[PDB]
Structures are given as C-alpha cells and as structure tokens.
Amino acid sequence: RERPATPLLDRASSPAELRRLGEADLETLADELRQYLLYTVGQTGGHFGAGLGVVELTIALHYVFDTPDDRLVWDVGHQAYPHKILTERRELMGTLRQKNGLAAFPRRAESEYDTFGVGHSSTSISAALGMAIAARLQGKERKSVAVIGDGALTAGMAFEALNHASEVDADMLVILNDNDMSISHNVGGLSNYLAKFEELGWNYIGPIDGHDLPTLVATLRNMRDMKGPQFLHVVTKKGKGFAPAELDPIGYHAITKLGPKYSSVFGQWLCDMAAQDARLLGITPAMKEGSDLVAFSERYPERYFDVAIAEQHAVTLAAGMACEGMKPVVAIYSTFLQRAYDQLIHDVAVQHLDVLFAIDRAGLVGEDGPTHAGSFDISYLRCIPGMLVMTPSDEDELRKLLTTGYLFDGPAAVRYPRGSGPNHPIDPDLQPVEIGKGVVRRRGGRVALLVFGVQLAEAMKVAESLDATVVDMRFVKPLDEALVRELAGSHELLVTIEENAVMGGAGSAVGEFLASEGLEVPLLQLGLPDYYVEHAKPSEMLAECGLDAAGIEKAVRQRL
Amino acid sequence: LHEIPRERPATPLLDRASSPAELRRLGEADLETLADELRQYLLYTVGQTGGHFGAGLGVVELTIALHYVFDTPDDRLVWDVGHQAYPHKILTERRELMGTLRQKNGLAAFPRRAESEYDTFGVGHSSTSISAALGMAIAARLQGKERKSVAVIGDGALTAGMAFEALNHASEVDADMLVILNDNDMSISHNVGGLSNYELGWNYIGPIDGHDLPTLVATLRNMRDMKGPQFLHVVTKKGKGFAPAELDPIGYHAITKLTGGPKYSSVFGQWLCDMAAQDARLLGITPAMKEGSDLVAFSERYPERYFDVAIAEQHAVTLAAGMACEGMKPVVAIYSTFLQRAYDQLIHDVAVQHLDVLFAIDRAGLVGEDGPTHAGSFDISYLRCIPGMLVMTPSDEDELRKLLTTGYLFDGPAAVRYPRGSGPNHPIDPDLQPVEIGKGVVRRRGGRVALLVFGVQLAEAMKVAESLDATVVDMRFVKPLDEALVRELAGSHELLVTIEENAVMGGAGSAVGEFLASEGLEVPLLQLGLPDYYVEHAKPSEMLAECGLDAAGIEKAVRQRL
Ligand SMILES: Cc1ncc(C[n+]2csc(CCOP(=O)(O)OP(=O)(O)O)c2C)c(N)n1
Ligand SMILES: Cc1ncc(C[n+]2csc(CCOP(=O)(O)OP(=O)(O)O)c2C)c(N)n1
Ligand SMILES: [Ca+2]
Ligand SMILES: [Ca+2]
Ligand SMILES: [Ca+2]
Ligand SMILES: [Ca+2]
Ligand SMILES: [Ca+2]
Ligand SMILES: [Mg+2]
Ligand SMILES: [Mg+2]
C-alpha cells in the first residue's frame, strides 16, 4: 500500500481543527482515518484491531470535549493510534515504534494531549479520578474522561477506583469500550454480566452503538455536563472496517510490518509435564497467546485457568491450589508480576507453598518500551526468603530449569526473554538439575564471566578472544557459593552478566557472598543501567546497555 | 458484659468443645450457652496477653455455627485477615494455648498452616480468603474429593481489588464454594467506600442476623449442600457483648494486656499537618490506615485534602499519580508490608513518569507480635532498584521530619521509611527545612572501623562505636548514595560495616557494595541487616536481638570480623 488520499483528515491535525469541521463531515472523516490507520500500521507494524474499534469513539471525543484542557485518559493505550493521529502526530506515524520515533502508547513527555503514560492496563479510572479531584480543588472547570476496555475493567484496581469515585462524588466520565474481547476472548464473571454500576454509585447510560457517530456525539454532549460519577457503556467491534481482523480478532490484535520462541519452549514443557503428572495446573492472567498456553488449554481444558487481567488473583489462587497438593504454574511476564508482588510474598513465599512462576519477557522487550521492560524480577524476587530463582541460558536450559523449579517443593521462579534463542538442541527428557549448581562452559584464566541468563552466547564470543573462563550460572538465589569461592581464588577479575537491573540484581548476590566471606577479588557487574531504556528493536536496546559482545568485551578490557 | 475478667472463668461447656469434633456432639440447645462461655473466655485471655479484640467478639456466634455445620478440618474454612480468628483457635485444640498467644514461641497472631491443620491458609494481609478458598475448591473437584470450601470476608476486606478479581473468577469456573460476608459496617476506621454504601454469578442469601445461632446453623446447613458460587450476607456488631467495645469500636480493635517519646507515625502526622498548613497543594492518602499511619489530626483539619481509599493500596498510588499530573502534591502514607501490593503502580504509574509523589513508609523493619506477615523487611530492596526513586532512611524523630521535608520538596518520586513505635527521643527542630540530597552526616570520628548506618540502629551503633573507638556515619540516603563519603572511608578504614533494618539481600548495604565494586575499591565490607528467613513473632527487642541488630549483636559481628 501507499499513502491513501485523505483530504479531510489533513484538515484535522488537532482537536481544535477537527472541532471546526461540521457533523456532516465526521462520517467521511472516519473512513479516511480508518484508511490512514490501516496504511501506517502496515508500514511500521504495531497494535491494530482495537484501534480500529475506537475510530468513531475517538473522533467524537475530541469533537465534543475541549481537549487538551479537558483530560482524556486511555486505558492501556494500544488503541490510541487514532488519538495520536488526531493530536498533531498523523505525519509522524511513520516513525511509530522505531528508535527515536513515536512510542507504543500515550506518553506525557510526547504530547500535551497524553494525560497519562499507559501500557499496563486498568490505570485510567484511577488517574482520571485523581485529575478530577485536583481540578475540583483548584476551581478549574475541566472534564475528566477515562476510556477503559471490558478486558482492562477485570483488574481489581479498577473496582477500587470505581468504588472511590463514588465516595468522593467525582465529576468524571468513565467510558466502557465493550467489544467482548481481550487479546483472547474475555473470560470471567464480569464478561458474562456485560453480555446481558448504578449500585456502585454510578449514573449508567447505554449501551450505545460505538460506531454511530451521530449518536456518540449526542450522547457525549449530554453526558459532558452532567454531575458526579457518570458511566457510558459503549459497544464496539474489534477490527471494525477490516474484514480479516473482524474475522480473526486474536490474530489482528497486532501485526508486523509488511529457532523456537522461548515461550513456545515453555508451552511444550507445560504440555509434556501435564501428560506425565495429573497435578499440574496452568494459570495465566489473560495472556494465553503471549505466554503460549495454547496447546495446554486445548489438551487439558480442566487444568487451564485464565483469570482475566487479574495478576494478584492468579497468584493467590495458585497458593490455594498448592494447599490441596496440586502443582500450579503461574505464567506471567516480568513486568506484570510487579502487580502480584504482595501475593507472591505473603501468600506463597511466607507459606513456602509449592508454586512455579514461569516469568516470560524478562529483560528488554523492544518496541513496547519501558512500561513493559522485564528489568527488575531478579532484584525484587531474590530478596524474598524461600524463593528459588533461576536464569536459563538457552532453550534446553529453559526446559531443564522449568523442570527443576516445578519439582522443587517450594516457590520457584524461572525467567526468560521474548523472542528466540541460539537454537541449541533440546533434550526431550523431563529431568531436573542439581539446585544451586552452576556449569562451567569454558575453562580459561585471568578473568571469569559469571553469566545469569541468555547473554551466555555473547560472553562465549568475548571469551574466545580473551581466553576467559565462562560459567553458566543457573541459580541466583541458591547461589553456587562453592564455585564462586574457587573462581575468586583462581582469577583476577570476576564479571557478572545479567539482563536485569544492576542494582539489587544477580551480580549483587555474588557481591554479597564475596563480602561476607572476606574474598577480595575485583568484581565488575554488567547488566541494565539505572534508567528507563527508550523503545527500539531489542538488539539496539541491548547494544545501548552494553549487553552485546562488543559492549561486554569493551567493559572487561577497560577493567583489566 | 462490662469488665474483663481477671480470673479464668467457669466454662464447662467450652471445656467440652476443645475441637470441632466434640463441638459437633453437643446439641443445638447448648450452642447459645457455649457462645456466652466462649465470649467470656475470649475476654479473659485477650486481657491476659493483649491482642485483637473487637473483631473476634463479633464472630463468636459465626465461628460456633461454622464448625458445627461444616466437617472441619476436612471441609476448608478460610478466615480473611485472621485477626477475628481467636474464637476459631479456641475451638480448634488451642484454647489452653491461648495464654501463649502473640508471645515468643507461642501461638501466632493469625491463622497459620504450620500451627494447626485447622488453619487452611496463613493470612494477615487482607482479601486473600476468596482466592485461597476458590483455589482449594478447584483442586478438590479435580481430585474427586467431596469437600466444602468457605471463605469468611469482612466488609472492609471486600474493598480490595483482588477480592473482586476472585469473585469474578469463581463465578466463571462455577466453583462449589461458600463466601460469607461478615458485615459490621466497619474497617479499622469506619468503612469509607462506594461498596460500603451498598449478578456477578453468585447466589446471594440475606442479610441474616450474625448473632442468632439458630438462623446461622439453619442457613449454613442449607447452603452447605447447595452447588455453585454461594454468597451469605451476615450482619454482625464489632464488639458484640462487650459494652465498652461496642461503644468504641476503634479503640477496642486491639488492646494491651491488663513514658517515652512520640511515635514515629505521630511525628509523621505532625509533619503532615505542619506542611499542609503552609502548602495548599498537599494531599494526604491512606488505604484505610488513618489511625495506624496517624492521619487523625490531618483528616480533621484538612478534610477536603484527606483521602481514605479503603483497603485499596493499588488505587491509592495511581490516584496520587493523577493528582500530581494536575500540579497537586500527594503524600501516600503506606506500611512497607502493604506497599508490596502497589509495587506495579509505584513503578509504572509513578516512577516511569517521574511524577511528584511522596511515600511515607511506616512499619519499616520488624513489627513485633504481628509477626512475619506484616514485617517491613524488603522496601529498601524493592525500591532502590527502581530508576528515579529517592530512598531515605531517618535515624531519629528530627531526621524523620527533615527527610519528609526533603522528599516532599524534591520534584519526583521520594520514599521515607521508618519503624513502628518510638525513637531515642531527641529534640525535633520545629522548622520545616530540608537537607542536601545524597549526603550523609558524620556523627563520630574514630578509626579502623566505620559504621555506615541507614536508619534507626544509629543509636545502637553509636554505643558500639564509642566502645570500639569507631567512625559512625548517619547515611540518610540509600539511593542517591553518598558516594564520595563511602570512598573516603574506604581508603581511611580497614572495615566498613553497613547497618539497616531491611533484608541484607538487595539492601542498602549492597548499594554500598555495588559502589565499591564498580570503582574497584577493595575494602572489607560487613553487611548487617535482616536475615534470609521469616523472623518468628516476639517482642520487637527480641526480634532485633535475634537478627544481631542491637548494640551487642553489632559489636559481636564487627569484633568477630576484625
Ligand atoms: C496489567 C496488564 N496485564 C496484562 C496486559 C496485556 N494486555 C495488553 S492489551 C490487553 C487486553 C485488552 O483488552 P481490552 O481492555 O478490552 O482492550 P481492547 O483491545 O478489547 O479494546 C492485555 C491483557 C496489560 N497491558 N496490562
Ligand atoms: C492489604 C491490607 N491492607 C491493610 C490491612 C490493615 N488491616 C488489618 S485489619 C483491617 C480491617 C479489616 O476490616 P474487616 O475486613 O472488615 O474485618 P472487621 O475488623 O470489621 O471484622 C485492616 C484495614 C491489611 N490487613 N491488609
Ligand atoms: Ca498478530
Ligand atoms: Ca537425556
Ligand atoms: Ca582451553
Ligand atoms: Ca548467597
Ligand atoms: Ca551508587
Ligand atoms: Mg475488549
Ligand atoms: Mg468489617
């Protein structure tokens, strides 16, 4: 495709210009906007289907509300490409999700029309409420509007926000963008009720057709000046306007521009262990596709649990299953495990319950940017007593360490990144490895590289030119102290490498052990720096952070 | 009743109901006399040891009925939070152990699995019961076992987001479980919330009188045998049967068994008021902990800038984010152990956007008889790894005031952590002045050993330092760490010692170690802090001594390294 002809959209580069068009033009503007959207997303890749579902709703909102003075908050923000296109950024969409281009989601630093950097779901009601409370105290006459999906509304913090808005009699509008969809279909008790609020203290209106610009513009006009907590139920269709996205809402949730993934390796381990042990239970907070429980859910429907977007519940539910003697596996991205932290600590680890966490998207995740980076799980997990914390270096180690944490009688974490690995051979057996034991991959001298994770291949390259010792550390928390102690006595430099924050990370565990035993060897900690890495392709981000061979080699040489 | 008995009461029927099995052999005509005896024993023993008071009083009839109608321990009973579960413990082979309650080596504060097969789920934090119960019911049905599952959740606990996530899921799996809403119109403070002022797939019964044993047994029997998501609305009174407690539900939430400086939370409360008197932008947030965090005076003087979000730690932090987007200045008062539940909101909504939000982290460190479920053991570890966080550890009351001011005036996310209880009782500067960020204060010049203290062990460290003639630093700042001072002491002394009331793993001491390693400074480093296990409940002094964090334990560790 090439740049579609869109003369009307070209007269609506900002809400004020859009607000100078006539209602008779909005209908045509929608077709134009859908065309430009389809065009640019095909040029760069990105999220697709949900943006198409809110083209009409996004036009109406900027037409009826005094944005940017009126505050508009988008939940998740993956459906916000139309919003960006109408807020001075249409002509920059060709840079979307590229280094130094537009970010994946609304970002305050990127435009005055983005009230709240989003990425994680279910924060919009809370943020809109806070803006509304502040606006009221300062006597401003601002509208506060939150657009939340029926999937994002399943999170507990959205219930908390709706309860609190009722309490403070907040003048805000919550717009429920109900399209019956999540990434997968929306499965949950609330989804069933949405198919068929006022009790909670909200003035409910709708449902209305979210693709009826005349109705949308009239409904919004009326609700725009009503007082107190207002709730508009709108019904949209994911992929509206593109036939094969309407047919395939899951596949067209996001598209690419016009060796097995680690998550696939996890999924076959899950199926293989389930065939061998009837105790296994697989849990995901609405990420069946991403974490890849697809086969598992089809082959063992009775042992598969999609808890919706409820990371907290996912974890405490696993704890309860562990009380009865089952073996739950919580599949969760490193960034989303931040939201279940208290359940991991209080309900699982304090009780030393037997729960395995399969921590995907560990490290840098690329175009989705810093809201989704898996930068912290080794730091936040390893300070927790009882936690077995593991960092596989390739597909085969992922399988083995899954097996090892699974069989371990206690809470265990295996983290691994998005994408593929060095494509080494995978042993089909299902046997564990000894806990707390590293593996020496290269016997060298002078400098030793203690690798926790998938930088091992890069460290081996470094090691051929330096003749370094290379250790495939497998465990962070049950640290292999004996190995570290001998390495510290036989080398002049220990170098730790990890795709995790340097502060509090795996290298610091080595450092703590060094300090406690009075071992005086020099130590160089390589890992993620103390700032939020800007979106780019994963290799660009790794290079920026010095976690490619060139970066590792340079830092090692300069230390020596 | 009007007095707490000082001598063990006569409880002939209670003595015949030492476990549910024998409780179930009594007759309906006896349960109401059992309840009266249970209530008397409860008052007696809680007056002997201290403990949670009013919430158990209100579930005395409910607990009797439950163990009478349900086949416990085979049927799964899960108590939410667990502070109301003393009667549950009295009826489950522990009545004669209640005299050890909340003491070192005695019964714990909450139900705990390793303490009794009658405690299906260790609790302390709230709102986990529906999840844990739904988890047990799913397993039971897959193992083909016919057991019942029951969660007893208070109206306060039900304001939490996870409880909603659990109700939505239970209805979706069509789980065979009973949720009982123990509704007494009360949290710790009055229950403030939209849910308070008041289909998802459950079968709702009630409300019913939670103190009428015959309706309870009748209804419970009925619902024990119904299928699918079952939901019983029961209404109780906090303090039922102890007049003074029904007249003051807040003051009798917990009691002491039957002089110093201000509490750190009281210092915070005073700081919050003074700073609100001079800045009209300041907003105070607590998730239902107005008393504990001590926003009492603030909430009375500045009602329009005080926000209690109920037991909703997550909304609390993201609300603050939004307040700061409009130029207001939110202060989130939150316990270390409870900030664990809003970690994602701090990181993604606050830290990633560098929003101006101050976190006053109370109950940092060991918290005493409440035991490991409430310990503030990790906040230094889980916050210092987050980019953009200013992380601060005051050593006394005046330091607390100064670092609150520093964190507030700082434009961005700041955190000030402090323990429960009182400090060394040093003069407090009435002014509102900040200190320079990232700079420690040399409080003693010695030699050979340098103590780098992050927080309230400073006084104990100063005692060891005078005995050893050591150098002592009051570090004040973990995350913008005083790199120049550490480096100076590393060349000057033979041993650096780090002291903090936080896990050694990932703690402030390891921030020092990270710094030494990156500059290749090779000085011996001894890290004192909290060990890598869960410290069993005791008096705070007893827990701190177990961890080596009093003057004697510090000196022993130092002198032993030397
Ligand atoms: C806390 C959290 N967990 C998981 C995700 C992964 N995720 C990205 S989009 C999405 C589903 C969106 O569903 P919905 O709210 O209805 O938006 P829609 O696409 O249906 O318009 C999910 C689960 C997330 N963004 N945040
Ligand atoms: C996540 C969390 N936040 C805060 C607390 C503090 N807390 C302990 S007990 C209590 C009140 C709970 O009220 P409720 O559930 O209604 O039981 P009641 O005391 O009325 O019987 C609170 C807020 C907690 N236990 N957990
Ligand atoms: Ca796709
Ligand atoms: Ca083999
Ligand atoms: Ca060789
Ligand atoms: Ca160790
Ligand atoms: Ca530093
Ligand atoms: Mg949806
Ligand atoms: Mg209550």
CATH number of the CATH domain containing A221 = 3.40.50.970
Task: Name beta bridge partners: B209.
Answer: B235
CA angle (B481 as vertex; B479, B484 as ends), nearest 5? 165
User: Do A245 and A330 lie in a common domain?
Assistant: no
Is ligand 2 within 6 A of the CB of residue B210? no
Q: How far is the alpha carbon of B257 from chain A, nearest alpha carbon, in Å?
A: 28
Residue B209 marked ligand-binding:
no
* Most ligand 2 atoms within 8 A of CB, residue of B53, B79, B126 to mutate: B126
Ligand 3: centre distance to CA A367 (Å): 15
Cβ-nearest to A321 among B120, B139, B338: B139
User: Do B51 and B199 lie in a common domain?
Assistant: yes
Q: Would A429 be classed as within a structural domain?
A: no
Contact B314 A188 (CB under 8 A): no
User: Do B143 and B243 lie in a common domain?
Assistant: yes
Task: List chain B residues with CB under 8 Å of A385.
Answer: 532-534
- Asked if residues B480 and A530 have their Cβ atoms less than 8 Å apart, the reply is no
Residue B469 marked ligand-binding:
no
- Show which of B203, B237, B255 is a domain's final residue: B255
Q: Would A427 be classed as within a structural domain?
A: no
Determine phi and psi for A316, rounding to 5 degrees. -65, -30
Method: X-ray
Residues in chain A: 560
User: Do B69 and B164 lie in a common domain?
Assistant: yes
Strands A327-333 and A280-284: parallel
- Residue of chain A nearest B388, judged by CA positions: A531
Q: Would A192 be classed as within a structural domain?
A: yes
- Among A467, A470, A464, CA closest to A452: A470
Strand extents, DSSP E, A92-202: 144-149, 172-178
Contact A137 B352 (CB under 8 A): no
Residues A373, A83: Cα–Cα separation, whole Å? 24
Cis amide linkage into residue B73, ω under 30° from 0: yes
Q: Would A420 be classed as within a structural domain?
A: no
CA angle (B7 as vertex; B6, B8 as ends), nearest 5? 125
Cβ-nearest to B124 among A192, A338, A346: A346
Ligand 5: centre distance to CA B441 (Å): 51
Q: Domain of residue A342: give its range.
A: 262-415
User: Do A249 and A314 lie in a common domain?
Assistant: no
Per-residue tokens: A370: 């810093």
* A107 φ/ψ sector (left φ>0, alpha ψ -120 to 50, else beta): beta
Sheet holding A388-390, edge to edge: A304-306, A280-284, A327-333, A356-360, A412-415, A388-390
The secondary element (H helix, E strand) that includes residue A447 is strand A447-452
User: Do B118 and B244 lie in a common domain?
Assistant: yes
Local structure of residue A345 (DSSP, 8 states): I
User: Do A88 and A168 lie in a common domain?
Assistant: yes
Cβ-nearest to B164 among A130, A156, A187: A156
Query: Is residue B195 less than 8 Å (CB to CB) from chain A?
Result: yes
- Asked if residues B358 and B408 have their Cβ atoms less than 8 Å apart, the reply is yes
User: Do A286 and A341 lie in a common domain?
Assistant: yes
- Show which of B255, B272, B300 is a domain's final residue: B255
- Residue of chain B nearest A500, judged by CA positions: B385
- Show which of A225, A255, A285 is a domain's final residue: A255
User: Do A26 and A116 lie in a common domain?
Assistant: yes
Residues B118, B113: Cα–Cα separation, whole Å? 8
Contact B514 A502 (CB under 8 A): yes
User: Do B450 and B469 lie in a common domain?
Assistant: yes
User: Do A148 and A185 lie in a common domain?
Assistant: yes
3-class SS of residue B392: strand
Q: How far is the alpha carbon of A446 from chain B, nearest alpha carbon, in Å?
A: 16
Q: Would A422 be classed as within a structural domain?
A: no
The secondary element (H helix, E strand) that includes residue A359 is strand A356-360
Q: How many domains would you assign to chain B? A: 3
SS (H, E, C) B327-362: CCEEEEEEEHHHHHHHHHHHHHHHHCCCCCCEEEEE
Q: Would A350 be classed as within a structural domain?
A: yes
Q: Would A372 be classed as within a structural domain?
A: yes
For chain A positions 481-520, those within 8 Å of chain B (CB to CB) are 501-505, 508-509, 511-512, 515-516, 518, 520
* Most ligand 2 atoms within 8 A of CB, residue of B125, B182, B187 to mutate: B187
**DSSP per-residue letters across A261-301:** -HHHHHHHHHHHHHHH-TTEEEEESS-HHHHT-HHHHHH-G
Helix-, strand-, coil-residue percentages of chain A, each rounded to 5: 45, 15, 40
Resolution, rounded to a tenth of an Å? Answer: 2.3
User: Do A101 and A135 lie in a common domain?
Assistant: yes
Residue B398 marked ligand-binding:
no
Task: Name beta bridge partners: B232.
Answer: B180, B205
CATH code of A471's domain:
3.40.50.920
Task: List chain A residues with CB under 8 Å of B165.
Answer: 154-156, 307-308, 310, 312-313
Residues B65, B92: Cα–Cα separation, whole Å? 14
Q: Would A2 be classed as within a structural domain?
A: no
State which amino acid sits at residue A76: V
Query: Is residue B320 less than 8 Å (CB to CB) from chain A?
Result: yes
| Alpha carbon distances (Å) from B302 to A245, B298, B310, B357 | 53, 6, 18, 19
Ligand 4: centre distance to CA A429 (Å): 5
Per-residue tokens: A172: 């805000």
Ligand 1: centre distance to CA A240 (Å): 18
Residues B330, B279: Cα–Cα separation, whole Å? 11
Q: Is A315 exposed, middle or buried (0-12, 13-18, 19+ CB in 10 A)?
A: buried
Please list, residue by residue across B411-436, b when 16 or more beta carbons sit within 10 angstroms of its beta carbon and e when fewer do: ebbbbbbbbbbbbeeeebeeebeeee
Task: List chain A residues with CB under 8 Å of B325.
Answer: 108, 115-116, 127, 130-131, 134
First to last CA, chain A: 54
- Asked if residues B356 and B324 have their Cβ atoms less than 8 Å apart, the reply is yes
Residues B306, B328: Cα–Cα separation, whole Å? 13
- Residue of chain A nearest B336, judged by CA positions: A342
